[PDB]
Design a protein around this ligand. Structure first.
Ligand SMILES: [Mg+2]
Ligand SMILES: [Mg+2]
Ligand SMILES: [Mg+2]
Ligand SMILES: [Mg+2]
Ligand SMILES: [Mg+2]
Ligand SMILES: [Mg+2]
Ligand SMILES: [Mg+2]
Ligand SMILES: [Mg+2]
Ligand SMILES: [Mg+2]
Ligand SMILES: [Mg+2]
Ligand SMILES: [Mg+2]
Ligand SMILES: [Mg+2]
Ligand SMILES: [Mg+2]
Ligand SMILES: [Mg+2]
Ligand SMILES: [Mg+2]
Ligand SMILES: [Mg+2]
Ligand SMILES: [Mg+2]
Ligand SMILES: [Mg+2]
Ligand SMILES: [Mg+2]
Ligand SMILES: [Mg+2]
Lengths: 50, 199, 98, 203, 38, 61, 147
RNA sequence: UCAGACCUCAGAUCAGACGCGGCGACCCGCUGAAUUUAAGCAUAUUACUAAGCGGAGGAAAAGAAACUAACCAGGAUUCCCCCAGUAACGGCGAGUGAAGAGGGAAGAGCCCAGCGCCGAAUCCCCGCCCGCGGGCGCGGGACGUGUGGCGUACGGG
RNA sequence: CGGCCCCCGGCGCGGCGGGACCCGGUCUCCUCGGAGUCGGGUUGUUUGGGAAUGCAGCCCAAAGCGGGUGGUAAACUCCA
RNA sequence: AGAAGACCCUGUUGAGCUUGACUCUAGUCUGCAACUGUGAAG
């Protein structure tokens, strides 16, 4: 019935900011990866007949 | 408490700072609230622009910014007088008026007079009663091409004009820029001490 | 040969000065014809303050330095003291003629 | 054109005419209670200069307050603590004596709102003030649009919150470098903003 | 004493009249009228 | 309910009604200005509203 | 990520990485910069010299907009204009010279750290260094003072 | 004054209104500590904080310059960003600490007293009469010890 | 950007009823301001404000080409 | 067994009390101007 150790504060740094160049970089890599048949099948999608 | 080479820090946390901590978890909802308020304000003044009245072009005070310009509070009464607009009629047609601002030069005076004569050229004044127009009211053919302007009225832009390239004269080559600055500082510093010797 | 400099006596970006009449707030505290008439009537009815009569007695005995130090101690700053000493000297020059 | 003369007449408070008027009145005002209603403003030109009008609903109350500083009300003058707070005698109250006059005139008359107040007399131990109160439920006040602002519920007991002319002076409000301490409304509003740790989301 | 304040504050009791004002506020404090009869 | 209805009909349109017949909205609401009082404007403001009201207008650009 | 923290490897170790002889007390040497002259003088004098004491004149109301004077050298002087401005004028060295307004680009004083391309140029600024003016006059350019 | 007026001051279960307490997260005006830090401790810090008292509102407060600036000038207030842990303060030790400018959110400006023109041109109350407002009173008052209109520094008539 | 029903609160367009109600531009003529307050001394407190940032007590006590400000006390002078 | 020795020492931990300890303070004495007027004489 006491107080927990180090009570969780609401001002914890929840949000992280990423550089716009890196956010665009990750999209250019996720799109380039959506063009390879090996990566889409290894993801688990059923594209064996598309 | 100190250790090997480091920085002497100054953490201003010797008060009850945790009692007064403002988090920004309502920042996204605030962006929607102001966006929604501008949409409601736009429907209120439907033909009139959503930004509001017209702001003049003013010069920023300090040396750090006296090269650029920005949007002031309102047009000076001297600029309203030069543009032929009454101080009280201007606020009815969406012209910001600032009875406090001065005009120490004619460059800034004629800058807004042109801006104030150009805004009245774009005005589409609807009649007070639609069934009977008046002198100042625009024609019915012009009232049809009247939409609500989005954004600030006449955005203030500073397009830099190029200095024309010219052949360097011998007077410009013989001008001592460093000597003219050092002597200017001495003549401005020793101005008072020389004015006493003349008495 | 002669450029506008940012330092020196003629410093500043050269612009044509716009000279107009001063704004109406600048005439504040200017003695009108009625204010002078009203204040002169109060002077006739009220008279002078005790520290003013004490200073007028020092001025008539040619003790202007002690009168200025007395007024300055009573009225405050040195600027207000001279303006009051000159006023109290004018009323002494007025009662001599009358 | 009589109010202009009275303005200049009341500026010569050290004249033989005003010293006599300030001597017999301060005697008369101290022979009454510390709070009593006056039938008319002792200074008619000064009252209107602050917002008074000869209408039904405007009342004048004369207040007598004890002059001097503020002695620390601690038992036997023993402030248990560090020598910084060992001061009892030479302590000055944050508000002026005129503000205390309106606080006592407005507290006794809860059905009225304090409008303004002015100085009418002094002494070695008493400062006399006349507080102008208004009956905000009188039809001569609610039907005049120039005075309907005080009938609002946001002006309840302005003298208790320092909204009157004399109570607002002790707050440090104003524009310029002299009043950097009250930037943002009040002093505590400025201090709270100056001591709030703004923690953004993407800080 | 925060615990002593929340033992006798508004809401800890019955609110014979504040529970009605909360209901009357949702309708704008309407009086002098009646619902439309059948 | 019958007698209360007749009492409101008797005091209908009278300046001073019993306290149980007057509307009970809220102590704060009953101490506001009337609809006619809050709509009263001084003669100086009536001229500024007649002459210098905000016109309806549009700007081309 | 608390999975990578040092506390996850100290689970089971009694002192939790703070020794058995000298435990982890609250403040065994004071709080903050305490003892900078008494028991932390060695650390202060060794790593933070000049920390204690007064030096120089005081300026009560300092407005940094008055002393605002951003500087640019000569090796980056042509960066204020386009590349075509330097290339088109490098063909006709005896013709007109390009005008580089340093004050418009946000530089009030021009210094002379770097060399200058062998072509004339009209430089407009508020302040000029002595070496900055020499390298412009020698290359065929001229210095113009702007208020 | 047909002899009473005015001034000042009382009484009433007089006619009609208002004030009181609660809540008090936010807000306004006061009051005011010490733990604590300075490895002691006294100024300092904690803190112009907690506790104490008063007063409101859905917001409050502030707010239309006795401002900033020293410029090629800015132009009510509030809030955000930045200025900046900077100028400055401080057993110049520990520590404390803003503002101008600049970028944004939002933007709305106005009213008196005084001064002098207008036959007090102004207002409340009761009763009656009309559809909470209106007329009517040869009704009662307030008011010249100053109400209303014009008019407020951007000048105004 | 579903239907139906009963209410509530707005806005736009028309007419009806009752209330307001002449604005600008030139010249001449005339008019124009807040006092036990500012300010000075002193005290206490407050502030980053430091020969005093604000506030307050007491004493002194204004002027009207005045008064306040111009981040170091003061005199003269100019200027904003 | 019952009790983180009350004895002793340490702590830059206190408290009660005391003074010619350090620094203050209520109170009290004293001085100045203000409230504070009228007149005579030295
Ligand atoms: Mg729990
Ligand atoms: Mg270590
Ligand atoms: Mg390290
Ligand atoms: Mg206000
Ligand atoms: Mg008026
Ligand atoms: Mg191990
Ligand atoms: Mg251990
Ligand atoms: Mg250790
Ligand atoms: Mg540690
Ligand atoms: Mg209450
Ligand atoms: Mg300590
Ligand atoms: Mg310790
Ligand atoms: Mg509290
Ligand atoms: Mg709101
Ligand atoms: Mg408000
Ligand atoms: Mg502090
Ligand atoms: Mg302090
Ligand atoms: Mg033990
Ligand atoms: Mg030791
Ligand atoms: Mg004990």
């Amino acid at each position: 019935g006491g107080r927990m150790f180090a009570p969780t504060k609401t001002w914890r740094r929840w949000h992280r900011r990423v550089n716009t160049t890196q956010k665009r970089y990750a999209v250019c890599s996720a799109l380039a990866a959506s063009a390879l048949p090996a990566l889409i099948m290894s993801k688990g999608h059923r594209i064996e007949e598309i | 408490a100190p250790s090997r080479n480091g920085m002497i820090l100054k953490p201003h946390f010797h008060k009850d700072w945790q009692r007064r901590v403002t988090t920004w978890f309502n920042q996204p909802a605030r962006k929607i609230r102001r966006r929604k308020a501008r949409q409601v304000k736009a429907r209120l003044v439907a033909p009139r622009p959503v930004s509001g009245p017209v702001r003049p072009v003013v010069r920023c005070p300090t040396n750090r910014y006296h090269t650029k310009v920005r949007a002031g509070r309102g047009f000076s009464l001297e600029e309203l007088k030069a543009a032929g607009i009454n101080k009280k009629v201007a606020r009815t047609i969406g012209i910001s008026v600032d009875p406090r601002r001065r005009n120490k030069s004619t460059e800034g005076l004629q800058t807004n007079v042109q801006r104030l004569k150009e805004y009245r050229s774009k005005l589409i004044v609807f009649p007070r009663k639609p069934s009977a127009p008046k002198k100042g009211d625009s024609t019915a053919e012009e009232l049809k091409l009247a939409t609500q302007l989005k954004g600030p009225i006449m955005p203030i832009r500073s397009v830099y004009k190029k200095e024309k390239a010219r052949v360097i004269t011998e007077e410009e080559k013989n001008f001592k820029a460093f000597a003219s600055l050092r002597m200017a500082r001495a003549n401005a510093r020793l101005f008072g001490i020389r004015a006493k010797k003349a008495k | 040969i002669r450029y506008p400099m940012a330092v020196g006596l003629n410093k500043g970006h050269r612009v044509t000065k716009n000279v107009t009449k001063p704004r109406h707030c600048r005439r504040r505290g200017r003695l009108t014809k009625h204010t002078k008439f009203v204040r002169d009537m109060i002077r006739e009815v009220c008279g002078f303050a005790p520290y003013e009569r004490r200073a007028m007695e020092l001025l008539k005995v040619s003790k202007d330095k002690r009168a200025l130090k007395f007024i300055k101690k009573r009225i405050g700053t040195h600027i207000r003291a001279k303006r009051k000493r000159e006023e109290l000297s004018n009323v002494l020059a007025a009662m001599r003629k009358a | 054109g009589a109010y202009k003369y009275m303005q200049e007449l009341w500026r010569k408070k050290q004249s033989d005419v005003m010293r006599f008027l300030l001597r017999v009145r301060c005697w008369q005002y101290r022979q009454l209670s510390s709070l009593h209603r006056a039938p008319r403003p002792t200074r008619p030109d000064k009252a209107r200069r602050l917002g008074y009008k000869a209408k039904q609903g405007y009342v004048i109350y004369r207040i007598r307050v004890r002059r001097g500083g503020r002695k620390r009300p601690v038992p036997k003058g023993a402030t248990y603590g560090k020598p910084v707070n060992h001061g009892i005698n030479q302590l000055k109250f944050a508000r002026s004596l005129q503000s205390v006059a309106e606080e006592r005139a407005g507290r006794h008359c809860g059905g009225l709102r304090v409008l303004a107040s002015y100085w009418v007399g002094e002494d070695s131990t008493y400062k006399f003030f006349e507080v102008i109160l208004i009956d905000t439920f009188h039809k001569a006040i609610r039907r005049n649009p120039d005075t309907q602002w005080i009938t609002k519920s946001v002006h309840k007991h302005r003298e208790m919150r320092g909204l009157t002319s004399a109570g607002k002076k002790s707050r440090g409000l104003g524009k310029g470098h002299k009043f950097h301490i009250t930037i943002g409304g009040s002093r505590r509003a400025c201090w709270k903003r100056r001591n709030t740790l703004q923690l953004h989301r993407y800080r | 004493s925060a615990k002593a304040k929340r033992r006798n504050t508004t809401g800890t009791g019955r609110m014979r009249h504040l529970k009605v004002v909360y209901r009357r506020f949702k309708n704008g404090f309407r009086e002098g009228t009646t619902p439309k009869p059948k | 309910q019958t007698q209360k209805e007749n009492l409101r009909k008797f005091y209908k349109g009278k300046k001073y009604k019993p306290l149980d017949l007057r509307p009970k909205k809220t102590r704060a609401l009953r101490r506001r200005l009337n609809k006619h009082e809050e709509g009263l404007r001084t003669k100086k403001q009536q001229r500024k509203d007649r002459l210098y009201s905000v016109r309806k207008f549009a700007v081309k650009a | 990520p608390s999975k990578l923290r040092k506390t996850r490897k100290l689970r089971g170790h009694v002192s939790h990485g703070h020794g058995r002889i000298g435990k982890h007390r609250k403040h065994p040497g004071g709080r903050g910069n305490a003892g900078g002259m008494h028991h932390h003088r060695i650390n202060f004098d060794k790593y933070h010299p000049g920390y204690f004491g007064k030096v120089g004149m005081r300026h009560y109301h300092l407005k940094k907009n008055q002393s605002f004077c951003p500087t640019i050298n000569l090796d980056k002087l042509w960066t204020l204009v386009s590349e075509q401005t330097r290339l088109n004028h490098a063909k006709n060295l005896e013709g007109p010279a390009p005008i580089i307004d340093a004050v418009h680009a946000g530089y009030y004083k021009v210094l002379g750290k770097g060399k200058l391309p062998k072509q004339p140029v009209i430089v407009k600024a508020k302040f000029f260094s002595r070496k900055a003016e020499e390298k412009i006059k020698s290359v065929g350019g001229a210095c113009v003072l702007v208020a």
